[PDB]
Ligand binder design. Structure first.
Ligand SMILES: Nc1ncnc2c1ncn2[C@@H]1O[C@H](COP(=O)(O)OP(=O)(O)O)[C@@H](O)[C@H]1O
Lengths: 68, 179, 480
């Protein structure tokens, strides 16, 4: 399986800790109006996110992968 | 057909045109045990991760287990397209399409207790003589719910079923009530 | 049970949660969500499973507030389809859809719980003794008699009636029926429900002193609730009534108002649930859900559940599916019409369309049937002569038909009732009249024998002798 692959396993868990910080999410799609961030497994529906540009947004749609 | 079935049919067609079908089947087993164990699936998913990092780590995992290049080509194309999140389902339906192409049929013989290998080959004889597959594969599963005999789950996927078991009582008693 | 959930997606009120593969709850099986509130940790919002999506996750509409839920919360299933406490404990208390008390008094006991969503009663045992009821309204006791031990429909537009009429009917019958009353506030405005609660605790029906003495048990899933609660408040009221018809064996009179909300909430959750949209925008399972409510209300050889649903015909769309499938289930339909409240005739029940399966002569009385036939035929004649009246001048129709028009005018005014609960809108005191007095009144009114009184002497009048006295008063203050 991945016994010798322990080093690349540490590499991919490192990349996951890079991309998956709690209370953090990455904007996949930003349409006219809504955005579709990826992440925020911590978020509640109706919680205010801050987009690190200075634009507040409310999170009404929590799909499986992306919070709308 | 499903999208996973289409991609698996592509992989099986390439492993058909190149005489490496059994090696490719074993490589798909290795790859599906790789794409289990969630953190690897989570890494190859999660489009936040850059595509270059993903393909680099994929190259490393390829050169680790020494996969066939066309199967490595298959996973790399899966990363190219946005359909990498179907990878588990594609490697899962690879067994179906591979069995269909190489001509063998799977018969899951589920009994109460483990079964003798010669008598399992007799079950394979019978199932083959009603299906017509060359190298009929029988992966058996010990079950506690049955009572005396066994069930066969040969067919497309579970589709056909023959069972002499607790179903004996069940059918005798569905015909005992008779309402 | 113990099946920890890990809620995957929360798409509006409909949340879908991914159980482990083996232990998975069934359909219509409650899910109490162990979650945090906006402030403070303990908060259990209840969800009832609607369907299983096959990715190890089930879709579950949320009965309580949906905000604050996070993706990934542990939830557990009761294993029982949302048990509700009923029986000798539920009396007097305004009940939530979840099975909780709302009126900030002591919590009830759970010794007599019952599953909310249960099998319909079989046709093998079905008590059907066709018998009339004397509700008190002139028109609806005459033109569209109500079948006790049966279902009654107070259809109407937006604001035509159907809630003041329900308040008058409960003010009449809550003391008459020795059986208990159950009010299901299915999506009715919260202030009218509180007006009803105050009216009940004042009129002795609640009797707040000894709360075990009430002749009523309320269930409120009113407007300010997520569409789960309006999808099951009707079934909570139904479970209370079904207990009072299974165990106490007493004829319980349940009131549901705005039953159309029990279809609207179903629509609002069905659109999200992936189920495709049906006609003009309701759920696809309109008929099955509406029947699953309105079939449990049948007199079932241990008692008789008379029920009065106040359907909300949306925007006077009489053809809309949500009342169109309820017209099939409802015995004594009473179609209230905005066009008849336009001219002030309250209640604005249509004399034509308000029809009943109890206007058969062997069931109601031959005199009652002949007088209802003559009244309804006279009103049909008036509706057919409306166009001739409207354009070609009132006088240019026939002279005998002019007698019919004056008689129809006197009738459609006389079938107005001053209610006790509507005394605030009319200013006149409420008057209660039985079936016999209004029968004898309609006889002499339509018979042409007293066709000389003024029209306003028949409008907003309790009885025929009251009308004769009102004619005296009016003709005196006319010259004076
Ligand atoms: N008997 C009556 N006398 C005076 N006004 C009435 C009478 N019946 C109904 N109305 C008027 O019509 C309205 C009907 O009650 P409402 O609760 O608005 O009906 P709905 O529940 O259909 O909106 C009342 O608010 C009242 O103003």
């Amino acid at each position: 399986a991945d016994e010798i692959s322990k080093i690349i396993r540490e590499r991919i868990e490192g990349y996951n800790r890079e991309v998956k910080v709690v209370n953090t999410g990455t904007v996949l799609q930003v349409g006219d109006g809504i955005a579709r961030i990826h992440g925020l497994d911590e978020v509640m529906a109706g919680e205010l996110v801050e987009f690190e540009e200075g634009t507040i947004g409310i999170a009404l749609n929590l799909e499986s992968n992306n919070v709308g | 057909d499903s999208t996973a079935s289409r991609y698996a049919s592509a992989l099986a067609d390439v492993a058909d045109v190149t005489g490496t079908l059994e090696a490719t089947n074993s490589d798909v087993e290795k790859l599906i045990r790789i794409f289990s164990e969630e953190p690897v699936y989570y890494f190859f998913a999660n489009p936040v991760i850059s595509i270059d990092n993903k393909r680099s780590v994929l190259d490393e995992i390829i050169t680790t287990s020494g996969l066939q290049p066309h199967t490595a080509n298959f996973i790399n194309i899966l990363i190219d397209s946005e359909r990498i999140n179907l990878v588990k389902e594609i490697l899962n339906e690879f067994e179906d399409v591979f069995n269909k192409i190489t001509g063998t049929e799977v018969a899951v013989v589920t009994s109460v207790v483990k079964l003798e290998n010669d008598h399992l080959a007799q079950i394979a004889k019978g199932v083959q003589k009603i299906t017509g597959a060359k190298n009929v594969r029988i992966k058996t599963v010990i079950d506690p719910s049955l009572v005396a005999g066994f069930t066969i789950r040969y067919g497309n996927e579970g589709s056909k079923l023959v069972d002499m078991s607790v179903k004996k009582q069940l059918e005798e008693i569905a015909a005992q009530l008779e309402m | 049970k113990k099946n920890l959930g890990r809620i995957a997606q929360i798409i509006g009120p409909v949340l879908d949660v991914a159980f482990p593969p083996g232990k998975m709850p069934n359909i219509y099986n409650a899910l109490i969500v162990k979650g945090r509130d906006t402030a403070g940790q303990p908060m259990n919002v209840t969800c009832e499973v609607q369907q299983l999506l096959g990715n190890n996750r089930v879709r579950a509409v949320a009965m309580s507030a949906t905000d604050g839920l996070t993706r990934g919360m542990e939830v557990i299933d009761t294993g029982a389809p949302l048990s509700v406490p009923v029986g000798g404990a539920t009396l007097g208390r305004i009940f939530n859809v979840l099975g909780e008390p709302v009126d900030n008094l002591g919590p009830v006991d759970t010794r007599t719980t019952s599953p909310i969503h249960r099998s319909a009663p079989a046709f093998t045992q079905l008590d059907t003794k066709l018998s009339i009821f004397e509700t008190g309204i002139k028109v609806v006791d005459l033109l569209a008699p109500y079948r006790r031990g049966g279902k009654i429909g107070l259809f109407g537009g937006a604001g035509v009636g159907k809630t003041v009429l329900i308040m008058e009917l409960i003010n009449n019958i809550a003391k008459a029926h020795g059986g208990v009353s159950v009010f299901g506030g299915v999506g009715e405005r919260t202030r009218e429900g509180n007006d009803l609660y105050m009216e009940m605790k004042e009129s002795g029906v609640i009797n707040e002193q000894n709360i075990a003495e009430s002749k009523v048990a309320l269930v409120y899933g009113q407007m300010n609730e997520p569409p789960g609660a309006r999808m099951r408040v009707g079934l909570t009221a139904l479970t209370m009534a079904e207990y009072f018809r299974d165990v106490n064996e007493q004829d319980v009179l349940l009131f549901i108002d705005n039953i159309f909300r029990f279809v609207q909430a179903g629509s609002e959750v069905s659109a999200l649930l992936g189920r495709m949209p049906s006609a003009v925008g309701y759920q696809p399972t309109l008929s099955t859900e509406m029947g699953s409510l309105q079939e449990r209300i049948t007199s079932t050889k241990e008692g008789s559940i008379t029920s009065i649903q106040a359907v909300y015909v949306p925007a006077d769309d009489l053809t809309d599916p949500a009342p169109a499938t309820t017209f099939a289930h409802l015995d004594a339909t009473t179609v209230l019409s905005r066009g008849l409240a336009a001219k002030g005739i309250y209640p604005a029940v249509d004399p034509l369309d308000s029809t009943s399966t109890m206007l058969q002569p062997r069931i109601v009385g031959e005199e009652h049937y002949e007088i209802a036939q003559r009244v309804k035929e006279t009103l049909q004649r008036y509706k057919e002569l409306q166009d001739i009246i409207a354009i070609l001048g009132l006088d240019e129709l026939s002279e005998e038909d002019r007698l019919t028009v004056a008689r129809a005018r006197k009738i459609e005014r006389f079938l107005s009732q001053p209610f006790f609960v509507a005394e605030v809108f009319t200013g006149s005191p409420g008057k209660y009249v039985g079936l016999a007095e209004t029968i004898r009144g309609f006889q002499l009114i339509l018979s042409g024998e007293l066709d000389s009184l003024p029209e306003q002497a028949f409008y907003l009048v309790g009885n025929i002798d009251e009308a004769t006295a009102k004619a005296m008063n009016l003709e005196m203050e006319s010259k004076l």
